[PDB]
Amino acid sequence: GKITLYEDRGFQGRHYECSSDHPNLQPYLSRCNSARVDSGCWMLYEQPNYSGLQYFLRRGDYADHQQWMGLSDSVRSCRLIPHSGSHRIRLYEREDYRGQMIEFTEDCSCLQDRFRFNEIHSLNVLEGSWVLYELSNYRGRQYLLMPGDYRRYQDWGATNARVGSLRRVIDFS
Distant-in-sequence, close-in-space partners of 121: CB < 8 Å, separation ≥ 6: 92, 93, 94, 95, 99, 152, 153, 161
Resolution as reported, in Å: 1.2
Going along the chain from its start, the domains and CATH numbers come out as 1-83 (2.60.20.10), 84-173 (2.60.20.10)
**Alpha-carbon gap, residue 61 to 101, rounded angstroms:** 37
DSSP 162: B
Elucidated via: X-ray
Residue ranges with strand state E in 19-156: 34-47, 51-62, 77-81, 88-94, 98-104, 122-127, 130-135, 139-145, 148-150
The counts of H helices and E strands in the chain are 0, 12
Closest CA to 162 of 133, 128, 127: 133
CA distance 64 to 14: 15
